[PDB]
Amino acid sequence: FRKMAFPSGKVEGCMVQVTCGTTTLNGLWLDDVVYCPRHVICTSEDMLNPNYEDLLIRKSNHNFLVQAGNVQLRVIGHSMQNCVLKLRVDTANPKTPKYKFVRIQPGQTFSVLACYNGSPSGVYQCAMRPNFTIKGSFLNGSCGSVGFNIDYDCVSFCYMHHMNLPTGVHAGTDLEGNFYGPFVDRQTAQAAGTDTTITVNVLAWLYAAVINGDRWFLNRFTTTLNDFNLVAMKYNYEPLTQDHVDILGPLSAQTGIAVLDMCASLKELLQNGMNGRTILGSALLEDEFTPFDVVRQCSGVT
Amino acid sequence: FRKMAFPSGKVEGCMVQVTCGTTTLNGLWLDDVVYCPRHVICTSEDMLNPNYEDLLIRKSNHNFLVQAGNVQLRVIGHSMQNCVLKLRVDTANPKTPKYKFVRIQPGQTFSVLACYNGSPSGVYQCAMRPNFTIKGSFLNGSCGSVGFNIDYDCVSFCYMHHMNLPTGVHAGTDLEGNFYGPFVDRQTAQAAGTDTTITVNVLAWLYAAVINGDRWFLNRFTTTLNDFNLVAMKYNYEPLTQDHVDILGPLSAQTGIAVLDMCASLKELLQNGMNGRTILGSALLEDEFTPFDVVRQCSGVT
Ligand SMILES: O=C[C@H](C[C@@H]1CCNC1=O)NC(=O)[C@H](CC1CCCCC1)NC(=O)c1cc2ccccc2[nH]1
Numbered sequence: 349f350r351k352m353a354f355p356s357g358k359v360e361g362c363m364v365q366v367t368c369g370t371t372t373l374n375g376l377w378l379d380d381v382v383y384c385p386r387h388v389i390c391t392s393e394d395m396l397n398p399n400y401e402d403l404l405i406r407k408s409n410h411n412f413l414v415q416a417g418n419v420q421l422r423v424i425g426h427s428m429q430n431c432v433l434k435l436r437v438d439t440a441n442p443k444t445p446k447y448k449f450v451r452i453q454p455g456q457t458f459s460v461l462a463c464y465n466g467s468p469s470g471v472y473q474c475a476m477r478p479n480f481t482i483k484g485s486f487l488n489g490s491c492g493s494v495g496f497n498i499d500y501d502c503v504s505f506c507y508m509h510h511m512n513l514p515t516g517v518h519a520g521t522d523l524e525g526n527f528y529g530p531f532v533d534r535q536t537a538q539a540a541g542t543d544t545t546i547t548v549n550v551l552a553w554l555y556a557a558v559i560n561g562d563r564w565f566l567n568r569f570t571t572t573l574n575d576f577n578l579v580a581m582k583y584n585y586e587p588l589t590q591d592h593v594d595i596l597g598p599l600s601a602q603t604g605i606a607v608l609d610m611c612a613s614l615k616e617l618l619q620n621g622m623n624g625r626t627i628l629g630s631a632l633l634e635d636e637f638t639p640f641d642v643v644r645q646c647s648g649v650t
Numbered sequence: 651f652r653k654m655a656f657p658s659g660k661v662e663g664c665m666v667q668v669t670c671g672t673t674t675l676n677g678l679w680l681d682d683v684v685y686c687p688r689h690v691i692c693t694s695e696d697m698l699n700p701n702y703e704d705l706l707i708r709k710s711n712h713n714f715l716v717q718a719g720n721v722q723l724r725v726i727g728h729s730m731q732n733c734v735l736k737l738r739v740d741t742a743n744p745k746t747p748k749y750k751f752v753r754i755q756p757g758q759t760f761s762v763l764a765c766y767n768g769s770p771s772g773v774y775q776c777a778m779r780p781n782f783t784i785k786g787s788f789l790n791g792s793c794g795s796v797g798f799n800i801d802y803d804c805v806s807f808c809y810m811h812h813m814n815l816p817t818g819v820h821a822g823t824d825l826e827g828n829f830y831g832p833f834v835d836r837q838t839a840q841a842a843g844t845d846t847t848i849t850v851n852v853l854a855w856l857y858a859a860v861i862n863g864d865r866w867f868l869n870r871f872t873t874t875l876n877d878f879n880l881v882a883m884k885y886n887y888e889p890l891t892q893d894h895v896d897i898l899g900p901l902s903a904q905t906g907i908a909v910l911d912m913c914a915s916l917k918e919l920l921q922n923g924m925n926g927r928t929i930l931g932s933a934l935l936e937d938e939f940t941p942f943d944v945v946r947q948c949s950g951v952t
């Protein structure tokens with residue numbers, strides 16, 4: 349049972365290079381607009397407390413060098429939406445897919461197409477953590493890389509990369525420029541909260557384990573939602589809501605294990621540990637598969 | 651530090667559906683040829699000991715229904731190369747990338763574009779295990795999905811999926827139809843060998859850990875290659891060769907830790923365990939990153 353990313357073809361055709369001054373990063377080229385992090389306009393003497401409105405007034409179109417492969421796109425206009433810059437260009441992208449901008453919920457997963465200099469370098473699956481960080485793999489020059497899901501024929505863009513935190517996790521915005529979490533785009537060490545474990549995702553992954561015949565952790569018991577959430581709080585697990593129990597319903601019915609029965613089993617794994625045993629090859633409980641990810645991997649959604 | 655797949659766009663445009671009788675699986679459409687597993691021509695009464703030569707003589711072009719999306723490609727001719735069928739079609743694929751067929755080495759990694767009914771469903775990173783299996787995620791209808799690497803602008807196809815084994819791992823061929831390992835395409839339970847751990851890959855991943863500041867496992871010692879390989883044999887780790895020490899050379903020089911020093915540290919992790927500590931977030935030693943994978947992720951190759 350593998351971490352699986354969406355195929356990345358539709359997104360690869362939207363990535364471009366955006367250079368402003370001594371800074372080069374990635375942009376997302378959809379129709380006649382290139383989206384990128386607004387901090388591309390900062391200079392080293394402006395990192396600590398940028399006034400982006402003043403800084404953007406100081407730039408003109410020709411300070412923004414946009415390239416799509418070997419094609420130089422001319423910037424026609426520039427505007428700021430929250431923490432993203434919108435560079436109007438003289439050419440619409442012929443490879444623009446059907447797309448939408450979505451702001452995902454904590455606990456939800458997406459694929460990240462990691463890019464450098466406008467070129468795709470790799471794709472992997474992430475989760476929006478409960479504290480609105482993501483545990484990504486990003487280097488210098490990775491800003492502007494996007495996270496997305498693919499629904500039918502529609503690419504739903506949900507994340508654009510802006511920064512790394514002192515703990516090595518990552519922070520960014522939706523495609524309207526609003527940061528996930530409390531983070532701000534200035535150069536200062538910023539705390540993410542305590543990160544909690546996405547309980548509904550761990551439950552989905554235990555269901556995946558049962559579907560694939562790995563069932564040693566099942567016990568005879570059940571529990572109430574209330575009794576469970578009291579144990580979960582002690583181990584920094586997110587509370588489980590009735591909506592979560594409903595989301596896990598199909599998985600429960602396919603395996604014949606009621607949700608509150610699986611919760612009882614998870615309760616014991618948290619109190620007793622794993623005594624050196626693994627589940628789906630993992631020595632730790634995994635929480636970056638949603639119930640939909642499990643169903644899609646265990647049923648073969650395309 | 652994440653398992654990262656290559657971007658899958660170039661490969662997605664080559665996937666087609668291939669139906670023969672009551673069996674539907676994926677084909678790889680390059681120029682005017684569709685490649686697929688030859689077992690697509692089997693019926694349920696022919697699974698146990700197929701005579702493929704006789705079976706293929708019994709088929710005609712019109713028993714092979716090939717579709718690329720909504721386009722029905724007419725089969726013009728059909729031939730068998732080892733365990734893959736080559737279906738000549740009346741149209742060359744306009745989206746054919748620069749490509750080559752390569753037979754990878756055990757220990758080497760590749761990306762798998764998992765497909766059902768000719769449509770890409772997900773992409774993930776695998777390793778060719780020492781016993782020539784892969785630990786994939788494949789369902790019914792996944793045969794014909796391919797594994798690949800991307801070198802510059804060239805897609806190097808290395809794997810096509812054929813079967814799952816009783817242990818739940820997976821077996822298949824190169825794109826010339828030769829199975830990796832001892833496996834044969836008939837319906838019988840087939841043993842893969844003892845699977846050993848890819849020592850050079852574990853060493854690369856320990857180097858990744860150091861590059862990312864996770865260094866608790868380092869010790870004061872060194873070791874000879876010979877003394878190390880004696881411990882490695884006891885824990886079913888592949889032998890480390892001088893070629894491996896040379897492959898790990900750049901990583902050694904970037905971290906300032908000689909290869910045989912890292913080996914000394916690995917020796918102790920194998921004898922003493924991890925006492926409940928993790929490395930790069932993992933409670934087990936990871937062996938499905940090559941030294942090149944590490945360099946590419948820690949340097950940002952595109
Ligand atoms: O692509 C460029 C990078 C991506 C980073 C870099 C290394 N790994 C990543 O994920 N973004 C950046 O380098 C941005 C640039 C921008 C400068 C102006 C105002 C706000 C931030 N800066 C940062 O991520 C960063 C600043 C910082 C200060 C204190 C502690 C951690 C920090 N991380």
Ligand SMILES: O=C[C@H](C[C@@H]1CCNC1=O)NC(=O)[C@H](CC1CCCCC1)NC(=O)c1cc2ccccc2[nH]1
Binds near residue numbers: 675812813815820840
């Ligand atoms: O796409 C079709 C599947 C992919 C499989 C199926 C479920 N998960 C996978 O990875 N291939 C298959 O289903 C092929 C079909 C073919 C039939 C004729 C001769 C040789 C094999 N059969 C198999 O993989 C298989 C047979 C078998 C017998 C004993 C123990 C394990 C086995 N696995």
